[PDB]
Amino acid sequence: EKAVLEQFGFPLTGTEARCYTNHALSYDQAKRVPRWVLEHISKSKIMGDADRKHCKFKPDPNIPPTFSAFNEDYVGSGWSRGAMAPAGNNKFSSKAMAETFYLSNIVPQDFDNNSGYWNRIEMYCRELTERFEDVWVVSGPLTLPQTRGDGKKIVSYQVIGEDNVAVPSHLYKVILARRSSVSTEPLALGAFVVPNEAIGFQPQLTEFQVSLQDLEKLSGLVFFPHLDRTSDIRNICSVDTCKLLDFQEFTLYLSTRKIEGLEKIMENLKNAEIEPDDYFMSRYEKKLEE
Amino acid sequence: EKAVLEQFGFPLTGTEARCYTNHALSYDQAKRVPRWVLEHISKSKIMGDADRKHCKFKPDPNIPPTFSAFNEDYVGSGWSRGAMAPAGNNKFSSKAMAETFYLSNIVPQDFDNNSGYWNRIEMYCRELTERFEDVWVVSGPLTLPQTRGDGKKIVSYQVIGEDNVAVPSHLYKVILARRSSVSTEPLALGAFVVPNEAIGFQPQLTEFQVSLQDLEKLSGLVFFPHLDRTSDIRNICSVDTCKLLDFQEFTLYLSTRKIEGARSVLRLEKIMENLKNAEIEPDDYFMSRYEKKLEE
DNA sequence: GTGACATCCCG
DNA sequence: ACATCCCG
Ligand SMILES: [Mg+2]
Ligand SMILES: [Mg+2]
């Protein structure tokens, strides 16, 4: 019965997973963006001598150029290029970091968001490695509806470039953290949904928190399926802080990262009512005397 | 490496092929609709004892109810439950028809478009069976962008129901036909995208025709991968008519049908009043079903 | 909640 | 566009 139906094959969705040195993903050929991107983080992965300024954005060679995004779509569009698996999670491997610049990892993102609030969540994930031995993170874009005047719910999103790359309304991140491979403690988990726009330091990460069941219904995905849900799972914002770097800390940490790449860093640093920490002063003198 | 990544598995998109008796589809768990639906038509298949009335729409059992559409999402939505694998194409099997009524084969479709223009395409699909041995149809939904005045391109589609089933702006349909298992005539292929609006009889099917490559880029799909593009493939609107039923033929057909259904003299007496009020010439075939029903 | 089975309407 | 420079 089916040999006749399947004579000329079935339409190909391009849905199959694609693993890389340190991240996997499913690609949406219609939207020219990922559907989901999964990564693993540890204290050792965020340490290394891999440099982001050395990488470059470019289409995933493993993606058929037909349904591939291109830098020509992003540049000048008013939207930035936001990796769903940060380069900063692949300090250990310059290769893994390079694969996170394949445009199959990137979506159109608000500049202030990509560098601001969203960035600070990526930071909060790498922080979880100081308290957890293993941290799994799934990220992806979303195009959610908006009820308006007539009460009709309308999904409305922009598409940029000659290839009409979908610009998402919100971004999501599902953080799964395990204390250790030998601990009896339950797993920490929390879903979050951020709007693709500038967000200040006033809103807390907990405000953008959603339930996993809801994020699955909206994204149409089932996250971490092997994970037993009747088993004991805990809220990551209850076990942990769900605390992002406030303006002071956040501005302090950036300066810590800039000195490695001089006299202007300190000048703008103090102007913003910041007291250079000893951890920053130490790194300052070392780089100052080099 | 992967061992560490996959430790709890990857997220499930639910896009794996789902084969049924006489059709296959890839479901969209987010949009609550199929991405593509692949059916096969033949002379024998459009002929059988299968009757629509016996069937009803219902959520597809194979789909997780979390990502399933429901009749409650459609009823009162202002939209109809339009099937992508038609029931009229599965009249030979009592089960293959019933499976088309799974909401995984359905999209929210304009009432007029579904029983009007879209219908004539599905009729013309079943009409290709006369001129062709085998026919392969791949129909599905679309949410195409629209350019504003300032230059932004925007995808703006509607969502309905508690479960938020997406309402496509357009529907597409790829036709692929073979003359006979015996013959050798190169295959006939055509691709068409139809707005989800009410369409008159004024437009003809060649107007809504787009390239397969174009349809593939817009949909994000590659249709019939095995089919060699280098091979001799024929524009089905050159080897065949690509002719739908005009108003007269179409109005004649429905009138012919509504007779047996009608259960009074007024209705039957009005059916013909519509043809002569619409300037249609009743044919002898209809004069029989009319005069026979008149006796009764 | 849906299988079957009646009833009715429209394009 | 491509090299050199600057944003959050
Ligand atoms: Mg980024
Ligand atoms: Mg229909």
Residue numbers in the entry:
A (entry chain B): 58 to 318, 325 to 353
B (entry chain A): 58 to 353
According to the publication:
ExoG is an evolutionarily conserved 5′-3′ exonuclease in higher eukaryotes that is localized in mitochondria. Compared to its paralog, endonuclease G (EndoG), ExoG contains an additional Wing domain at the C-terminus and bears a signature SRGH sequence (instead of DRGH in EndoG) in its catalytic ββα-metal motif. Here, we report that human mitochondrial Exonuclease G (ExoG) may participate in this particular process by efficiently cleaving at RNA–DNA junctions to remove the 5′-end RNA dinucleotide in an RNA/DNA hybrid duplex. Crystal structures of human ExoG bound respectively with DNA, RNA/DNA hybrid and RNA–DNA chimeric duplexes uncover the underlying structural mechanism of how ExoG specifically recognizes and cleaves at RNA–DNA junctions of a hybrid duplex with an A-form conformation.
